[PDB]
Amino acid sequence: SLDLRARVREELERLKREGLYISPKVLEAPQEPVTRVEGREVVNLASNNYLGFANHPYLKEKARQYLEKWGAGSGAVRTIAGTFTYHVELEEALARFKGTESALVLQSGFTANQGVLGALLKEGDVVFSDELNHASIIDGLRLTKATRLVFRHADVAHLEELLKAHDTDGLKLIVTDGVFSMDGDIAPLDKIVPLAKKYKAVVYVDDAHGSGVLGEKGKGTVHHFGFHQDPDVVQVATLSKAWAGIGGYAAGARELKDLLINKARPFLFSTSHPPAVVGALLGALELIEKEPERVERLWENTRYFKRELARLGYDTLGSQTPITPVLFGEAPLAFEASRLLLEEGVFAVGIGFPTVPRGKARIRNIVTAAHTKEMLDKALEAYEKVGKRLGII
Amino acid sequence: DLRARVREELERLKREGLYISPKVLEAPQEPVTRVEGREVVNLASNNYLGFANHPYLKEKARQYLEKWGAGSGAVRTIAGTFTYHVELEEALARFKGTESALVLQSGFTANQGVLGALLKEGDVVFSDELNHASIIDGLRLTKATRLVFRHADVAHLEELLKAHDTDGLKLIVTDGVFSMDGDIAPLDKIVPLAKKYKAVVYVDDAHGSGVLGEKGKGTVHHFGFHQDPDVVQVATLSKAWAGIGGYAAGARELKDLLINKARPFLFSTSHPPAVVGALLGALELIEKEPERVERLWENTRYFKRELARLGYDTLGSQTPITPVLFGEAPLAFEASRLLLEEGVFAVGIGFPTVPRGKARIRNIVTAAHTKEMLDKALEAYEKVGKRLGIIR
Ligand SMILES: *Cc1c(COP(=O)(O)O)cnc(C)c1O
Ligand SMILES: *Cc1c(COP(=O)(O)O)cnc(C)c1O
């Protein structure tokens, strides 16, 4: 009986009633630590441009080469006629970078979770998910017949308790964000991986925010804890953030690759990526090798920034990564703080309930290697000012 | 135990004949290309308009790449929306003749995004039984009641609309062009039936976009239902438009719902300058060169006519998707091997994927195919069909 326009109207009203309705801003200059929003130069702490690569001329030149050479599109899925020399070149470079036996590029970090989780899990397997796991993962799991258990965030005690209570002639898969998207804390892999080996279980790390951030040259969270050649650790990560393009990889055992080619639904049914994207990611792996400095500078800036927000008496939720949250509780106050920051030429988006828990709305700030001190001090200056008016310092 | 699970699963897949070993292309996506170090005529791509390697799209991508960089550094709804995303969605809607348009990460995730944003516990979906896998995943993530109607059977569809109602939303869901047989959804009859029972029509036009309607405005536009607010279309930009991503096109308010509720719009980085450049390019190009769409159909007709001359069954295909019936799957895969031996590259498809006595080779004719190329493929189809004794 219900019409379109009508259903859409009902649903936007509900979202406005619950305080959750969002109005995305449009950026009017390239993705850089300083950019234009609403016709004003702002300091940009909303991006995931961790290494300053989103507009770096090296990556742009590599993309230009490959675009000219090969074209604007693979005309098909990898498994029919969409695999070209350049996809292999990238997967070869990725594995070598990662120090994994293999690597496979899929169409996003988002679909990577669906693809790998779907390929790996059957009716009978048991999954142990961290409760704060990214939405991308929840969707992946929901498309499998596996028994889904949740453990309290980063709680290795509760995790162990659950591993004793659930066993299988099949597969036990512990699943965690490597770096938690909105909280900015690191999965305790030092303790999780050992625990995993004690109970014949496999560890799956979604390292969207660890890739290009954590470990020697940003080889990632797994590589940082030194578990990268363990055949019972699987890692999937986006190439959209620090590597500043699009797509996600799945890295580990040579035989894993060959399973995903055969069983991963987004690899089977969705076009492979064009030359320009693959060019740019080849470029990015080349660049981080030439310039490991950038990763140091990312952390100097992170430390400086977190220290000052602490000095001013902001709670940073014991963040350990360049992700530097500031909690506002209800979403309306989060969006307001965002508006006031922007008035001071500082861009940091308020985040609300679909994306982050109810009663736990925040502003995520994301310090990058490309941020200069001048920029970081302007943001703090503004955070001081905006914090005074709301009387939270 | 990971090695173990991987090993057991590849074994099962090899046992069941399902294991695949993708062939690697060594030259650009064109109607003639190199696979395994041989020049072939390429009828396996979705490069419908010859855009995958067209210098116009490459030059537009180059412009936008130079101007803007290698990446949006975020999801659209935080810090990933730039001028160029707006430019594209504005050009898309105007091209489509819809009130609005929104670009998502794929046609694949577009289904999940829009189906998820639109459906609540209580709604009823009527799916065509041959609907693309992409859709099944979308629906499986909603709390909607899922009903299936016999392929393109408007009679069974009507019967189901009498048998199931809701104070909520009735959504009929169909591929616009069906990927395997290349038949067109009967929208001429479906949309009227939909208006008779206060239901909304959802068309996945991955293979209609850039193919069907004036300048490939698509299946919806072809049947003249493009300004109806109760017809929703999602389609890939990866095939005829020869890049990546999918759009959702329709009512102004649909866009604003998807920005808010579509899970792949909220949780996946927006697409980089070069991709958006190329797609802007493609919409510009098809306007300048409506010829290409004509040429796609001339070649489709030419090719289907000759396969008929030789006495091949083309399954009443209506689209540049040209099946060629080989009956049993074994013979379909064999014919696929032998075509490639003659420098002709096409996909054999059999039982799990298509019914048991209806295995075929899918060919995809494009505007970029010349007659020389089409006659080489026919030459080969003649030869391989004689030796296998399925044609005079
Ligand atoms: C090709 C196709 C898809 C997937 O489009 P991608 O851009 O490859 O994700 C989805 N649905 C249908 C009907 C298709 O033909
Ligand atoms: C950003 C992110 C994703 C999605 O990455 P895309 O490739 O942009 O879809 C998935 N998981 C986590 C933890 C993320 O941070």
Q: What are phi and psi of B365, to 5 degrees?
A: -70, 135
Please enumerate in sequence order all residues whose Cβ is within 8 A of that of B49, keeping only pairs 6 or more positions apart, or say none: B210, B216, B240, B241, B242, B282, B286, B292, B293, B296, B366, B367, B368
Backbone CA torsion sign across A332, A334, A336, A342: negative
Say which of B71, B109, B169 has its CB closest to residue A2.
B169
- Answer whether B28 sits within 8 Å of A258, measured CB to CB: no
Tokens of A244: 């500043």
- Answer whether B58 sits within 8 Å of A80, measured CB to CB: no
Whole-angstrom distance between the N-terminal and C-terminal Cα of chain B? 55
Residues of A with Cβ-Cβ distance to B229 under 8 angstroms? 3-5
CB atoms within 10 A of CB B121: 9
The CA-based dihedral angle spanning residues A125, A129, A134, A140, taken in that order and rounded to the nearest 10 degrees: 10
**Distance between Cα A338 and ligand 1 center (Å):** 37
Please enumerate in sequence order all residues whose Cβ is within 8 A of that of B222, keeping only pairs 6 or more positions apart, or say none: B187, B208, B212, B213, B214
- Taking alpha carbons only, the member of A142, A144, A145, A146 closest to residue A125 is A146
Name the A residues in 201-260 with CB < 8 Å from any B CB: 201-202, 231-232, 234, 238, 240-241, 244-246, 252-253, 255-256, 258-259
Tell me the CB-side half-sphere exposure of residue B177, using CA atoms within 13 A: 24
Range of the domain at B254: 55-288
Q: Touching check for B14 and chain A: CB below 8 Å?
A: no
Elucidation technique: X-ray
Say which DSSP state A320 is in: -
Cβ proximity of B209 and B48 under 8 Å: no
**Coil, strand or helix at A311:** helix
Q: Tell me the sheet residues that pair with B147.
A: B126
Active site residue A209: yes
Q: Tell me the sheet residues that pair with A351.
A: A362
Distance CA B19, CA B33 (A): 25
Q: Which atom of ligand 1 is nearest to the CA of B237?
A: 7
Distance CA B54, CA B68 (A): 21
- Altogether, the residues listed in chain A come to a count of 393
Please enumerate in sequence order all residues whose Cβ is within 8 A of that of A48, keeping only pairs 6 or more positions apart, or say none: A209, A240, A241, A242, A366, B73, B74, B269
Tell me the CB-side half-sphere exposure of residue B368, using CA atoms within 13 A: 22
* DSSP letter for each residue of A177-206: ESB-TTT-PBP-HHHHHHHHHHTT-EEEEE
Distance CA B180, CA A102 (A): 33
Distance CA A63, CA B66 (A): 10
User: Where do the H-state alpha helices sit in A291-389?
Assistant: 293-311, 331-343, 373-389
**Distance between Cα A51 and ligand 1 center (Å):** 33
Tokens of B288: 């300048």
Q: Strands B124-128 and B145-149: what pairing?
A: parallel
Distance CA B290, CA B49 (A): 10
**Coil, strand or helix at B38:** strand
- Altogether, the residues listed in chain B come to a count of 392
Say which of A12, A72, A246 has its CB closest to residue B272.
A246
**Coil, strand or helix at A346:** strand
Number of DSSP helices (H) and strands (E) in chain A, helices first:
14, 13
Please enumerate in sequence order all residues whose Cβ is within 8 A of that of A299, keeping only pairs 6 or more positions apart, or say none: A322
**Distance between Cα A208 and ligand 2 center (Å):** 5
CATH number, domain with residue A258 = 3.40.640.10
**Coil, strand or helix at A147:** strand
Q: What are phi and psi of B330, to 5 degrees?
A: -50, -45
The amino acid present at B151, given as its one-letter code, is H
Cβ proximity of A158 and A291 under 8 Å: no
* DSSP letter for each residue of B215-240: GG--HHHHHT-TT-TTEEEEEESSST
Cβ proximity of A62 and A279 under 8 Å: yes
Tokens of B51: 């855009």
Cβ proximity of B193 and B162 under 8 Å: no
Please enumerate in sequence order all residues whose Cβ is within 8 A of that of A140, keeping only pairs 6 or more positions apart, or say none: A113, A114, A116, A117, A118
Q: What are phi and psi of A301, to 5 degrees?
A: -65, -45
* A172-177, strands of its sheet edge to edge: A102-106, A248-252, A233-238, A202-206, A172-177, A126-130, A147-151
Q: Which atom of ligand 2 is nearest to the CA of B75?
A: 8
Q: Touching check for A283 and chain B: CB below 8 Å?
A: yes
Q: Touching check for A339 and chain B: CB below 8 Å?
A: no
**Coil, strand or helix at A106:** strand
* Residues of B forming the active site: 179, 207, 239
